[PDB]
Symmetry: D2
Subunit: 260 residues, 4 copies
């Protein structure tokens, strides 16, 4: 059973990484960042996202685990001083795997798929943002504002939360769309409410004038030219976590936003 | 196969009801409001809610169908002039049944269960509303404001929508909690975001000073004294609709809030 | 120069009141709760509101001052341990007076005026809340929801803030109206945005079906039957504070909601 | 008394412009786009903003007037078919001038002032947006989100409205700040409520890491590097409108967002 460990690169996370590799050396555990089976993130949630995207082609073969050196994270939910007990149970242990749903983002020109852990956003490159929203091949609305954000269940606690979106429990295979500063007068009308779509529903964005958009998936932001369709749906692929303890999602929400 | 038809009582809905009973008389269809198998609502969504609560003890044995004489409703989605084609297919037809999730509300003193189609709300009888929120036996927050609203998937388009809640597709077995004018300063903290809970999750409300609350289930509002716990969870019971046509939930949302 | 002191009634505020009366006795300062010139509140903001409404017929003749025994308040902005220095400067001192705007609320039947320090709210007695909104004799909208709240500048930090309202600086003679869980579909339309009205603007509420409303002014809540019009405007009367120090309104907002 | 007329450039507005110049030729009215006294905008609100910024150095010497060829605008509030009656009263008439407040935006490096009619916004060039907010030389908060928007009274109906801001009547000399998708957890805290500042209050933005910002004034968007301070305050300069009729601001709000 192979493993690898990424670090935030600062003074604290690098020294915590070298002490776990030394601890993992007392066990016959091979370090392999090429085709690992246990990926360990040390730092914050952004480090976990980078660690996730580094191996998004082997999601079935990998069980993730995150350690937080700064604040408490939603994916990095392991205190740094608890690493020695983590190394012990992650070696000689069987534990159990927990899986979360993911978001597929398809872009067509005149196809490019993506996998997101938190959210995927769309904005305009310069001019005003105007798109028609199609839900299962039915025109629902014509949005105009700053943009739109489609979130995963676990990602509702991120950017989705800042846009008024609802926090969904990760056991629900769904995706949530939220609006960014839309225009609503007697002429232009958007729904306003966040929308939650189940598995096997397809939300499609279609341009109306400008065909250049600034699509961002998680932290990765990029620019697309002459875009024909942006296609959202819940991915069949799932991330796999490795849990040694009961840390409820609703408890992580509490400690992060209420008090801890 | 028995049937019954409730009416809004006005001049328009009563005459539409008598023309369907006459149409149903050409077929060997017995009218029975005691133990029917097909309940028909004529009027609005409020008439459908009353028709629902009139037979919430025979939900498996009943397939509902609603006709709207005023506006377009979410449960009453059949144009009045389409009643003759409805009577024809509802008699000699097999159609297909569609089921939505429901909400169970338990109240304990020193137990009383309820079934809601839209939402269940809690407020205080006079004084300020203060409750502790417990999620699966874990204290999540101490709310203080006007009250709280727990919504069903199909009920997100009602009161839940007015509170900033997200609109969920009815195929998702879940419930959504939304806040009513909460207080948030450096001392008192609520989450603010609407919360979506899956099946088999229990949200419990517990008093902090006053033990009298104005609990309302759908339209039925009542007052409870010396309350110990308000217990929410997704009911195992489901309502059964009878669909003769493709009318997507997202299309009903469009026609009701965008344009029609 | 006469004075009086009200108390929250608890063990802490009553003992703090008797130590100031003893301190005020070393000076030739007459205690008079009939026609005072300096009203002192000890406890919280609710105690200050009661102290305000106890003498709302002598607002020009009174300069208010509040002490907070619990949390920090917006009107009770004096630490309890700073009472001896307060008694000293309030006796032999000239200080300076600060004035805030107030809200006039007129109710007509088939007239009853009120003065509010924070806000005045309107709801329905049982049935749905439906009112037409008239602004300077021009029909602006037909509201339907839970109710409406009209706030004073200093009251924007209270109930107005919980309804999404903006926080106005008290030096602005204005009033702010905010909506309570309104209904908005393709048929019924409200503005949604909080509205800020200047001096000499009249916002009038007019019933549409039910003519019974639960009008509340600050903490005082009451019920009115067969109501014809609810009339809002900025009062010409102003409350008078007595400031010995620089405590900016924006600083009080910071300490109350950010950190202190 | 000189005059000039700008056009949207389309087929409809250009032909409406040439018919007014011909009408203004029957009167001894000199056309002068260098130093006019009456500026006329034909098209939309964006055309009025460009017409405003074309002469923001002669605001006292100019009384503006806008005609709308597309929708109804807030600054272009004159029906196209009413141009002949406009030309008549604008020539031989005295009318009356109406003045609105404006927003001053100062940027310092290691000064550049601006005048806005609607709003001024700040965002980050790439990285996360983090700024400290200083109000009259007092640190109020440390914002982190997408950005911030400071609005004028008449501009509250634009971008400010899309951010949850309140609509202020133009007779109030003030400015309103609204937040753009801020982050709020147990660590990072923003006020959330829109803030309304009176005349002679200074809101200052100060960077925390990145010193490059995408400042936008009305429609004009630009990029600033190595920024030290962004300084907001209500300008002493005021725009001057020329009104021939009673068109209340609250009525323009009604026709634009409710119905017309
Ligand atoms: N991109 N970036 N950097 C900002 C990272 C902010 C914290 N954060 C990242 N993911 C999150 C998540 N799923 N739930 C809650 N909080 C999260
Ligand atoms: N109680 N009551 N009367 C007011 C009824 C208002 C309309 N309405 C009722 N249920 C609804 C629902 N599920 N989705 C959308 N709209 C609904
Ligand atoms: N009614 N009551 N009790 C609840 C009192 C809550 C605190 N509070 C009262 N006035 C306030 C005000 N103007 N600004 C901020 N906070 C205020
Ligand atoms: N920049 N740009 N183009 C978009 C212009 C949108 C309409 N609009 C411009 N100013 C406005 C204002 N003060 N109140 C309301 N609506 C306004």
């Amino acid at each position: 059973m192979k493993y690898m460990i990424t670090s935030k690169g600062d003074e604290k996370s690098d020294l915590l990484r070298l002490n776990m590799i030394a601890g993992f050396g007392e066990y016959d555990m091979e370090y392999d960042d090429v085709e690992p089976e246990i990926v360990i993130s040390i730092g914050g949630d952004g480090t976990f996202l980078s660690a996730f995207h580094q191996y998004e082609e082997r999601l079935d073969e990998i069980a993730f685990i995150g350690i937080h050196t700064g604040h408490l994270g939603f994916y990095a939910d392991w205190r740094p001083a608890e690493a020695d007990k983590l190394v012990k149970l992650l070696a000689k242990g069987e534990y159990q795997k927990v899986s979360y749903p993911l978001l597929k983002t398809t872009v067509k020109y005149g196809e490019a798929t993506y996998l997101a852990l938190n959210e995927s956003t769309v904005k305009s490159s310069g001019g005003p943002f105007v798109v028609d929203v199609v839900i299962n091949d039915i025109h629902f609305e014509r949005f105009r504002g700053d943009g739109l954000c489609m979130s995963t269940p676990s990602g509702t606690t991120a950017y989705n939360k800042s846009l008024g979106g609802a926090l969904m429990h990760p056991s629900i295979e769904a995706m949530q769309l939220t609006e960014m500063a839309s225009i609503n007068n007697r002429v232009y009308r958007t729904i306003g409410s966040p929308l939650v779509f189940p598995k096997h529903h397809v939300v499609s964005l279609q341009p109306v004038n400008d065909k250049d958009f600034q699509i961002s998936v998680d932290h990765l932001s990029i620019l697309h030219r002459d875009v024909q369709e942006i296609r959202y749906e819940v991915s069949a692929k799932k991330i796999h976590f490795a849990r040694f303890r009961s840390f409820p999602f609703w408890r992580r929400v509490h400690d992060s936003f209420i008090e801890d």
